[model samples]
Target: AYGSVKAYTNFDAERDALNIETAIKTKGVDEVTIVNILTNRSNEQRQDIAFAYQRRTKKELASALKSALSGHLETVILGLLKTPAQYDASELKASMKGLGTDEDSLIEIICSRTNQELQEINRVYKEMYKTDLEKDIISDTSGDFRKLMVALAKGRRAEDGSVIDYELIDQDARDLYDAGVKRKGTDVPKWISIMTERSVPHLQKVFDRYKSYSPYDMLESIRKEVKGDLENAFLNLVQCIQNKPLYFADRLYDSMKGKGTRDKVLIRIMVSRSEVDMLKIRSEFKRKYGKSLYYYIQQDTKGDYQKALLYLCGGDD
Candidate 1:
């Protein structure tokens, strides 16, 4: 259940703090030193190192790295510094900033995360920004999309995957069929409630039975019934519930492929999942894209940013 980044052996937080200060305090910023230390350590270790850095220098580690580095490297390092919940909270906050909201970021973070994770993000969001994450989603988004985001923010999804009811699963599948593909119009409320409230294992069974009830699968039904951000949100929830690593792998591919690189997406996925499931994500990436996540990082990125990401990718496979 661990991630690509494991706990460092014979770890010394104060020593790391000193090394980090030296890296930043030198005539030129030691990008190599920064990348080596941060990428090799777990998030828990990074937090400890950050605290030690502050205690030793009376300066914040995040701000120091931010001032020393520029571009994606700075972003990657700062992201590594945050606790997982704080990272999610910051991303959620950033998504709602400015004129147009980054609905994709909101959906990715909210839908992919667990109930416990979302609850922490909610608490951290308030602590960090003094505003409710749910409130921001409501204000920034509209209609069914807004409803889905808020419903997910409530963190009511059933987590007991071990005790699934076969009868209820079938009925839920029937209900979903009647809601969308089996009916002339879609039942937005039904779709929202079922998708957001069901357990992952229960949803998997329901989706399987859905094909028996309807001509199309759950994914096709979503595509047929809903459009725009709502459709993407529903699809994201279903996909994450089904296979989170595969969902992330596909997302990483999308960020790297084509003409321009989506560095924000790449950096967020790499940093956040570094200690969660980046190993599986890399495997899924190679299986689906026929290229290692590391290879893509090499082709699409350069400099310290690429090195840090490759380190997080765990291995070539």
Candidate 2:
């Protein structure tokens, strides 16, 4: 309901398919038309368009797009075509494989996604990789970090509409306080259990209550108690529970603000959130950074890739 990209009210899959085909066959490649059609439609609409394109021409739409486009622009276009589960599963697979793992991407996907989405992602991950998502995660990660990832991968978080018990909220807050802020050595399992299992609303209350029980705030305590990947993961989970859009705003700024851009993150957030919460992300981005995401993107990227991303960014805050 709170997504940036809505379905085109006058959408015509066959017409879009034909227009895309014309763009592909035109002199040089009409990327402007291609980007406009793809970015304006929701992922579901894009799939229908791709289906129509393939049925008429017998040439796979994805393969055609890949051949006509190159680099990050191609990444954005292809990302637009896949269903949410397939897109996320592919990103998860890519993160864990190849020489070293991209732990940030792994944490980003696993920690921030809903249980329903995670269930679909796990199923798709198995279909795509022919192996368990948990097994790959376990093999790639280790120690408490592995423990936390697997705990979250189970996708058993309390359902969104479930009742939030007041007593349980206070207890979880106290448990979190005891496990980290009020302890000598941290109880990593306790933190993982509470963070991974509780509903977001419940956790929000728990974190609010936690401040009363501890000297330091929940995030500050996490920083002091745990170091390395586990620390970042915990901090991200907390931020997500509190305000997911703001968390994404920070991640977007992180990706674009530096000598080199983190294109994987840029593409992932832009493509994934476009249909979900890019509007809120855009507001939070401008609120936090004091500049529109469009502004940073315009400065950071060039040519067609930047144009497609600007389309997905939707508009300046």
Candidate 3:
């Protein structure tokens, strides 16, 4: 499985528990030690440290973490404490909070996740908030966009990978061409159905097959075929299926490109993907953006939070 942030092998759960608690107790919340101990440990070990820390100190560790830390640094540390599923659930919940739903956050999350990952997020959503993840999406979104999220949340995409279907791939590609390119108005259902329901491996073949004769890249066709939320939702899936690390790399770049920092996006990607493909993401970030992710992060942020991010960046891009 994809992972960069890994468990501190030969970990001493109790030792880390004490160390983290002690760090928080020290003057100014010894941010460096907190980052070092937490970043070095695995999620499960972190969980252990929390339980032990709470049991020993008679104060809940998560509450302690919140009380002890603040700013982006606190956010990063809290994010590290949760299981990946928990993080996704929280992010999805936050995305839909307040006046307007964060549609892009929804697209970035629900679309990019694998069936298993989405299922875990959904399960955690219900457990954490006592509400169905699907219900939340349905409430916050409308039209085909909502339907697309539902399709993804339901995890209907075939898990085919070991085998490839050439003839069917060609048929799907031709059908895609007919649906979007061969006709006047786009057959959006065809695009959504094929993109959402098909396996990533199958879609790769279909996209490649289509490119053999079609005048545009799969993404270009998607851009022409849809508009607004639906377009972004579809493109997220297509881009993720094409190359997940690269897709994430582009997101990281976009988050930092303009004036000021898109902190949430940067934090989300950094915290979420730290243990997954950060190594490859760093490489892709360097390859596409012509600068190391570390380079950008260093230039864009500072303090203990920046230190934690650099730790997650894993190295100089």
- Backbone Cα, N, C clashes tallied per candidate: 0, 0, 1
C-alpha displacement of 94 in model 2, angstroms?
0.5
- Over the stretch 212-293, how does candidate 3's per-residue lDDT look in tens digits? 7689988998788788998898888888999999999999988989999989899999989887888889888898888899
Q: Where in model 3 is the C-alpha error above 4 Å?
A: none
Name the best candidate (by lDDT): 2
TM-score of each: 0.98, 0.97, 0.97
Query: On residues 99-161, what C-alpha lDDT tens digit does candidate 2 reach at each position?
Result: 489999999998899999999999989998899899899889999989999999889998766
Query: Considering TM-score, which of the candidate structures 2 and 3 is the better prediction for this target?
Result: 2
Ranking by lDDT: 2, 1, 3
Candidate lDDT scores, in order, read: 0.89, 0.91, 0.87
Q: Estimate candidate 3's alpha-carbon lDDT, on a 0 to 1 scale.
A: 0.87
RMSD of each: 1.0, 1.2, 1.3
User: Runs in model 2 with CA error above 4 Å?
Assistant: none
Question: Candidate 1, residues 30-128: lDDT per residue as tens digits?
Answer: 999989998998889999999999999998989888999999998999998999999989898888865588888988998898989988988999999
**In candidate 1, which residue pairs get closer than 3 Å at backbone N, Cα or C atoms, i.e. clash?**
none
Model 1 regions lying over 4 Å from their true place: none
